[PDB]
Amino acid sequence: VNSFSGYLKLTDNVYIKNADIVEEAKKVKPTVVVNAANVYLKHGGGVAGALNKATNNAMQVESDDYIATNGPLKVGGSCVLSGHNLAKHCLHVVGPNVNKGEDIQLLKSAYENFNQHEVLLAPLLSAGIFGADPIHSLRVCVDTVRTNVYLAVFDKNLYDKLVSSFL
Numbered sequence: 446v447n448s449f450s451g452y453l454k455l456t457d458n459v460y461i462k463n464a465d466i467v468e469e470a471k472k473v474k475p476t477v478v479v480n481a482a483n484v485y486l487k488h489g490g491g492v493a494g495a496l497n498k499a500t501n502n503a504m505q506v507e508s509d510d511y512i513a514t515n516g517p518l519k520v521g522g523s524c525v526l527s528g529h530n531l532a533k534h535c536l537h538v539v540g541p542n543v544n545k546g547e548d549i550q551l552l553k554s555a556y557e558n559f560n561q562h563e564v565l566l567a568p569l570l571s572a573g574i575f576g577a578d579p580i581h582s583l584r585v586c587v588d589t590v591r592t593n594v595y596l597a598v599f600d601k602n603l604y605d606k607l608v609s610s611f612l
């Protein structure tokens with residue numbers, strides 16, 4: 446049993462809710478919240494900008510030190526950093542950004558990072574300002590992630606479309 450509430454069950458291991466991931470993280474304090482990161486961990490907008498703002502920029506400060514030491518992530522890759530006031534840990538995962546021309550096949554590799562964590566609160570990778578089709582992202586999630594994932598979808602209209610079109 447876990448503390449996630451109000452989710453619709455899509456499969457054995459994937460759950461979905463219309464929710465603001467920031468507000469959901471603040472309330473559950475999950476072991477892992479996933480950030481929709483870029484390779485530079487520049488948390489300017491989208492989910493990343495919102496998560497970072499909720500940490501009062503502490504996520505960005507930590508991230509800048511990480512990059513100065515380690516260099517950029519790979520598209521499809523990830524790193525574990527602090528969850529600050531939102532979660533124990535933040536898994537920063539880089540999905541391909543269609544608006545930069547990155548290969549959507551890398552979306553499966555991005556979701557594979559979730560399998561290193563037993564339970565996660567997450568957004569749909571490569572959705573929103575990353576330009577991919579969220580219906581496709583949900584399909585890849587379901588077909589790739591085997592651990593227990595609680596997906597937060599900000600937009601109510603999109604949430605309803607994702608549920609109603611789910612096979």
Ligand SMILES: Cc1cc(S(=O)(=O)N2CCC[C@H](C(N)=O)C2)cnc1N
Nearest residue numbers: 446447448473474475476477563564
């Ligand atoms: C292994 C496991 C993790 C989680 S959790 O990452 O979401 N988190 C962990 C910390 C306490 C949180 C809570 N508010 O109880 C729930 C939930 N259930 C589980 N069986």
